[PDB]
Design a protein around this ligand. Structure first.
Ligand SMILES: CCCCCCCCCCCCCCCCCC(=O)O[C@@H](COC(=O)CCCCCCCCCCCCCCC)COP(=O)(O)OC[C@H](O)CO
Ligand SMILES: CCCCCCCCCCCCO[C@@H]1O[C@H](CO)[C@@H](O[C@H]2O[C@H](CO)[C@@H](O)[C@H](O)[C@H]2O)[C@H](O)[C@H]1O
Ligand SMILES: CCCCCCCCCCCCO[C@@H]1O[C@H](CO)[C@@H](O[C@H]2O[C@H](CO)[C@@H](O)[C@H](O)[C@H]2O)[C@H](O)[C@H]1O
Ligand SMILES: CCCCCCCCCCCCO[C@@H]1O[C@H](CO)[C@@H](O[C@H]2O[C@H](CO)[C@@H](O)[C@H](O)[C@H]2O)[C@H](O)[C@H]1O
Ligand SMILES: CCCCCCCCCCCCO[C@@H]1O[C@H](CO)[C@@H](O[C@H]2O[C@H](CO)[C@@H](O)[C@H](O)[C@H]2O)[C@H](O)[C@H]1O
Ligand SMILES: CCCCCCCCCCCCO[C@@H]1O[C@H](CO)[C@@H](O[C@H]2O[C@H](CO)[C@@H](O)[C@H](O)[C@H]2O)[C@H](O)[C@H]1O
Ligand SMILES: CCCCCCCCCCCCO[C@@H]1O[C@H](CO)[C@@H](O[C@H]2O[C@H](CO)[C@@H](O)[C@H](O)[C@H]2O)[C@H](O)[C@H]1O
Ligand SMILES: CCCCCCCCCCCCO[C@@H]1O[C@H](CO)[C@@H](O[C@H]2O[C@H](CO)[C@@H](O)[C@H](O)[C@H]2O)[C@H](O)[C@H]1O
Ligand SMILES: CCCCCCCCCCCCO[C@@H]1O[C@H](CO)[C@@H](O[C@H]2O[C@H](CO)[C@@H](O)[C@H](O)[C@H]2O)[C@H](O)[C@H]1O
Ligand SMILES: CCCCCCCCCCCCO[C@@H]1O[C@H](CO)[C@@H](O[C@H]2O[C@H](CO)[C@@H](O)[C@H](O)[C@H]2O)[C@H](O)[C@H]1O
Lengths: 419, 419, 417, 419
């Protein structure tokens, strides 16, 4: 019973997901039949299960091919703890059973995030897309608590959780929407619109990830980091340069990936949620989070923020609504900080964005009451000309870039602050 | 530039039939046109012949490239002795002429299976698929003898015998079914169903041959063989491990090949006979042989067993039907053992399966008699609960695995008897 | 490391330099033409392809001109939109002049910098000479009110048109926009594709065969012989004059046919540059055939406006004197547009005096023909000999003008430069 | 001038026609618009000229790039001497003017064939496909003499004489048939049939030229030539082997080229004359020349043989028809040998085939009169069965292979000279 299985895995091809442009040749041909079927309102179940698995495995057979075994564990784990809840949801419905099942479904993510904190080495049950997979898994469990979801076969569950395009780090979806958009193949005109948008997304992804992302990440970021470290100190102008360059590099690389993922999803007939919709023209933090990482932000708003507000109002822990809203903002953003990894700078990012949202809500209330004061006194309301818009965009852009510097992790390198 | 023809043949590319997964890329592309042409009612004869010859030659080259010549001679031999009988078939059917023609059709296989035993290593005319091509040749001399075949062209004959997806060691076929199947191209929906089933077969063959066959073949079997040899003796627990692991490895590897062959055959518009339909769950040995290697077992039942029973009843040599059935069982299984190869363990395998079949038949007769005895005595008949079925399945599974241990030739290493 | 050296590292593809460039262009522009067949336009794909090929054409040995292109784009956007906001209110007849001057300012700086110190200014790049003409066009089309509303997409799609850009035919905004909006039907698209293939073939013949023969086989040795023999005039001077004239035509017409072909592959029929110029009977009929786009641009926006301005102030006594002065000034402005050297200005003034002499000769011929018809004498016949004489004299004068424009007289002589 | 243009012509890209399988990717992508336009009943006159000129130039820009200049002369020659007849044909029809114009049109071929005899070096006017273009450019004059041809534009003349596929060494056509097939674009069903036949021809051309021609020409022919030269003498077994191998190599290489040319022609909507139609089952010399090099043989039969027979019968030079037929056979085959080139072995080939045809006609007459003699005497007519047909096949095959040995020029090496 020799254990050379790991070395067997570290031999397969390693076609990187959305790596070289030539990838979109292979994938394109691999997606040529499926799309054709949609034109005849015919869906090939087995062929999709073949292409999705082949490309997932090709994406996961890298230097750390062992993660495949972890994946083959993870899936099984979810099948154990989703279906279990379904059985329970047929008969009884208690808060503590739902909480336990949510915790047990999200436990692999908790282990992957916490193990480096304790051991210092990556956990065994960690693979490429786990952070963006439990979101689907636990998502389904939440839908069973509300009663929205009642029946689903294993084929639907596994084709939803393991969606090929949005697997590595892609838009976070929901089961209800994905299933409803999977059942009803769009008519020919909508399918043609989807094909045109997919080609446009592929071209823009080429531009974003292979040109602008490369310029901002492999040409300016390393020398800027080196100069900032060499000058040293608490802060310096090269740190401002690296902050802005990293913000733009992060945005362009992630937008390129998201455009690729949405294009490949459209080629399969499913419209995955968008990720970025002009995030930098946002003139406010609350308007920013409706532009930046749309899928993740909306997921945390629907399932972690709204539910917490409902829980807090159920027990009326806080008297006024504003205090409860601020507390929910802080807790939601802190949980979003943990999700990235339990280090010092991710928690700082979460607390910083939570404080930003609370400050923005307070300023909205103060602006409203100041407008009331000026209107009652007969004076004109506060200006809303181009200058106020420019000031708001400038403040939002600066705060967002500060957040992307803190999230960058460069603040460890600049000053070795352990905690 | 050439030297000897054998060296030039060795220089040619070698593609193991269903070896690395990339093989299915080649075939896929090579079968991309033909299958599309199947949707309409047209077939590309030249393209099919060229691709079939290409892949047969690629599978035949390598270290044993000289066998290609052994193929060509073989083909001519069949064309000499099939067509000859055709002419004779139009005049009269004398039994001895039919026997002579069948013998001369199977003569290359007789030489291949009898040459290494006498003094040599391998006969010259031996090549890769001769074991599973004689069945497609002597399957015509019989069909003419019964008159179900009267007219056919050389194109049909050499397109049926040299079927590319079923050449090396594949599902044995019959001429009448194959020809009548290739004449009538299926409809559009049937073709889509066949494509979906072909993709399912490809995936399941991947699992059966590149994972499970690898696990049971090169991970457990060599260490278990080493432990069994080191412990020595008549038998040991490592020998039992070898038995079970080799049986599962044989089933998984062969079912992987057979699913690959059925998939590639479906991609060319022909549904080749299925080899395995859930073995290891057979209650009886008689039910086992309707599930394990279905194509060959059915071939021997139709053309070796039933004909033997008909011959024995024609001369009424034996007193009753039961004796004829038992003798036919023994002789048919001995002929199967001979077909595998003239060694002590193959003949032991054939005799073992024959004794199993006759004992199963005797047990069925005795059970029917005792059920009649209980019915006439008023007692409730013998139980048929889940426990009895489980016991029957367990007994059949153990007997089959013992037969596969004998067929493995491992007992030759473990005992060195009859060396 | 990212510097100007990074820009210089980028691949370089001289526009219409080798046939493989046309293979690249055909492969790139096939989807656009196929989409045009179905009356649909791929806005993002066209922009990406145009930017790609502009960058490839600009990333030469001196690839530091891309920064100049970006600065020029920003400058033109700023001033065009500054006028657009201002035009809707009122036109002061001097703010229009200021905006036109500030739109031609990069070009005038580029054409005046090498004269002053030693070299061209920083903001010089490849197509700046044939891009200003587009920008000023818009300003003109705002002063007369024929243009009122347009978006930044239309403006930057018209100005940075990839097929022409470098030296291609000069377009106008009104015609270009009305042509871009209305995709032609399928039969006209097929006719345009066939004409594009014909243009590609004829451009091959003109630029890669005839231009090579007249520029690499005869011109260098003829120049060497002319320099060796020396003197004001010589037979090698005639050789270099004729060879350079034919080289200029067979190279520029080849480039313009390439540009029209590539433009037709994107659904727009750019103005034709040459319509068989060497058969022009008169000097005035030569400019309707030689560099048609530029000559028509100067006639419409520099000549006619100058005549209208002079007439509305009635500075001169009669119409013919105004026409002569407008001819001379327009051709001098054309020479200046080419570059501030002695021979370019000599070329401009030469063409101006040629046009005015042609006009005077036509008027004198009309008067003398009227007198002869009054006297009963038959007018001078023109069947094959007079027309041949006119064609020959116009061809000789044009070839002399191209000798002057060549700058070869700068090498042959050493006049004050 | 400088005169370096030839060196310029040598730096152009080179692409041997039908040299590599990758060449057909370029050819198919270039010819796709023409085929689509055919499907819509449209011909793009300019685009066809562009693709034809580009591929002619790519075929002619080899080490002998200077031949392009010769080609540019050849066209300018032929035009001058085609229209010089077209103007004359309308006015007067003296025989000697037609003879003079035909001679002047064929003069470049005469110079290319004669100058190596005198000077010993290839002539300036020689280029790749002059021998298969003079045929078209003299066929137009021959048609014009008969009055079959009338007003024709220069576009038709130059698109006929310079056909892109059948240019280097391709099927020899006629103007009337080519023009009539150019005007009437086939229907959609005929276009589909042409596409199928073009793909079949391309595949068979791959097989014939890149596999079988390579086997017979680059692996067996050099060793057989070396052995035959080493043994020496008038005749030897290696020389017989080289005779048969060269015959098969010539047939396979030429048939591969002809299938390629017919395929590319079908992709343009024009079906050029076939070149080979089962040559080796001829059973006779006449049935061979009606099967071997169909285009060239039919051209020489229509314009050089029939015309000479008509001339001889016009002046009744010989007493009987058989003598005139034999003389015409000999003269036609001598002119064919001359067309191949003025050496000893080409003229020997021509006179050998002429004698073969004459004795075949004598054999037919003698067989007919012997059959008449036997019928008059009441005896059974001479047999015509499998054995007689096999004897005829054997005799014709041996004579044809001897002819291809003489045409090979190998007899010049082995027999004459020294080595
Ligand atoms: C009434 C009495 C007089 C009648 C005369 C009838 C015949 C007159 C024919 C005169 C025109 C012949 C034009 C071509 C002759 C030479 C062609 C030849 O030999 O073939 C060369 C080219 O190959 C061809 O033959 C190409 C095909 C053309 C065949 C002839 C076409 C014209 C036929 C016209 C027949 C007209 C009959 C009368 C009609 C009323 C091969 O090159 P070479 O180097 O071997 O040339 C020969 C060598 O130099 C010895 O001089
Ligand atoms: C369902 C139909 C379609 C299925 C997919 C069809 C396409 C499949 C392509 C598989 C091969 C991809 O080919 C790709 O080649 C690249 C570049 O050479 C190689 O690249 C890889 O090499 C090895 C793994 O082999 C890794 O250590 C390396 O880091 C990685 O770059 C791999 O060999 C393979 O990742
Ligand atoms: C230390 C923690 C981080 C500090 C974070 C600082 C960022 C705080 C939020 C950004 C500043 C918001 O401050 C100001 O808000 C007002 C009031 O909505 C915005 O004003 C706008 O608000 C909304 C748009 O969403 C509209 O309804 C309104 O009409 C418009 O005026 C201004 O554009 C912005 O300048
Ligand atoms: C490496 C092994 C090489 C051995 C194989 C050699 C290739 C096999 C040769 C096939 C024989 C070719 O000869 C064949 O003759 C038969 C007899 O009519 C005809 O064959 C035809 O048979 C039937 C008749 O309807 C058709 O359905 C079929 O599609 C067609 O092939 C053709 O004429 C020709 O295809
Ligand atoms: C030494 C080599 C030989 C060893 C193997 C011998 C054969 C192995 C099987 C022996 C019998 C086991 O089979 C056991 O009995 C019979 C045989 O069909 C089955 O039962 C059978 O008999 C009765 C009716 O006749 C019904 O129950 C049923 O319709 C039928 O299948 C049992 O459900 C099965 O459990
Ligand atoms: C979405 C885009 C679709 C458009 C299709 C793709 C167009 C862009 C890719 C083409 C890039 C060509 O890339 C360029 O090719 C030229 C062609 O000689 C070569 O260029 C190199 O050699 C040439 C001449 O030999 C020199 O003049 C040049 O300075 C040097 O860089 C290089 O290979 C590369 O610089
Ligand atoms: C090499 C240097 C290149 C410099 C940059 C060149 C590109 C500059 C940006 C081009 C786009 C600017 O145009 C801005 O974008 C949007 C989104 O497309 C345009 O939107 C629209 O533009 C035009 C206007 O009808 C439409 O034809 C087009 O289909 C649509 O995109 C807006 O009109 C404008 O707000
Ligand atoms: C740089 C110095 C100037 C260079 C030369 C510039 C002038 C060159 C052209 C001068 C001649 C004008 O060219 C002249 O054009 C007119 C009108 O088009 C033609 O035709 C005219 O004259 C002919 C003479 O029979 C008559 O038909 C009629 O009077 C009129 O049509 C003349 O045949 C041609 O000679
Ligand atoms: C509308 C017209 C469409 C035209 C389609 C495209 C035509 C152009 C084809 C590509 C240009 C020629 O591409 C050709 O490629 C071959 C590939 O060996 C190379 O050419 C080669 O020719 C010969 C044999 O082939 C070699 O011995 C030689 O060393 C090399 O020059 C060059 O790279 C180029 O001559
Ligand atoms: C230097 C001379 C080179 C030429 C060499 C000979 C070339 C071959 C031509 C000779 C004829 C061969 O082809 C000949 O055809 C005739 C009539 O068709 C047939 O002739 C034969 O069969 C016929 C029946 O048909 C019988 O009368 C008899 O057995 C015999 O004459 C044979 O098929 C073959 O003998």
């Amino acid at each position: 019973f020799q254990g050379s299985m790991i070395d067997f895995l570290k031999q397969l091809p390693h076609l990187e997901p959305y790596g070289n442009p030539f990838y979109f040749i292979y994938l394109g041909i691999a997606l040529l039949p499926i799309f054709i079927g949609l034109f005849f309102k015919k869906r090939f179940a087995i062929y999709e299960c073949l292409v999705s698995i082949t490309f997932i495995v090709l994406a996961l057979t890298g230097t750390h091919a062992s993660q495949i075994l972890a994946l083959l564990f993870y899936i099984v784990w979810q099948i154990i703890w989703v279906y279990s809840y379904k059985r329970y949801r047929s008969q009884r419905d208690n808060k503590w059973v739902f909480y336990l099942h949510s915790f047990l479904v999200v436990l692999p993510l908790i282990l992957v995030k916490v193990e480096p904190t304790i051991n210092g080495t990556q956990s065994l049950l960690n693979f490429l897309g786990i952070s963006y997979l439990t979101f689907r898994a636990v998502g389904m469990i939440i839908e069973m608590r509300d009663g929205v979801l009642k029946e689903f076969t294993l084929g639907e569950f596994l084709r939803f959780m393991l969606f090929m395009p949005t697997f590595t780090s892609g838009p976070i979806d929901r089961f209800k929407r994905f299933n409803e958009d999977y059942q009803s193949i769009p008519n020919r005109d909508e399918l043609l619109n989807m094909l045109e948008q997919a080609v446009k997304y592929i071209m823009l992804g080429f531009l974003y990830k292979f040109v602008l992302a490369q310029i901002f990440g492999s040409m300016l970021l390393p020398p800027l980091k080196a100069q900032a470290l060499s000058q040293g100190g608490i802060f310096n102008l090269p740190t401002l340069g690296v902050m802005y360059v990293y913000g733009f590099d992060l945005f362009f690389d992630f937008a390129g990936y998201s455009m690729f993922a949405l294009a490949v999803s459209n080629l399969m007939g499913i419209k995955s949620p968008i990720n970025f919709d002009k995030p930098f023209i946002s003139r406010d933090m609350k308007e920013f989070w409706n532009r930046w990482h749309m899928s993740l932000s909306f997921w945390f708003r629907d399932f972690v923020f709204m539910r917490l507000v409902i829980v807090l109002m159920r027990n009326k822990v806080f008297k006024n609504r504003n205090t409860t809203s601020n507390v929910a903002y802080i807790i939601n953003m802190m949980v979003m900080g943990f999700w990235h990894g339990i280090t010092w700078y991710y928690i700082a990012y979460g607390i910083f964005h939570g404080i930003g949202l609370v400050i923005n809500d307070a300023w909205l209330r103060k602006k409203k009451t100041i407008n009331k004061d000026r209107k009652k006194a007969g004076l004109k309301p506060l200006p809303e000309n181009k200058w106020t818009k420019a000031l708001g965009i400038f403040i939002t852009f600066n705060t967002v870039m500060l957040s992307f510097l803190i999230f960058s992790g460069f603040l460890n390198d600049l000053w070795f602050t352990k905690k």
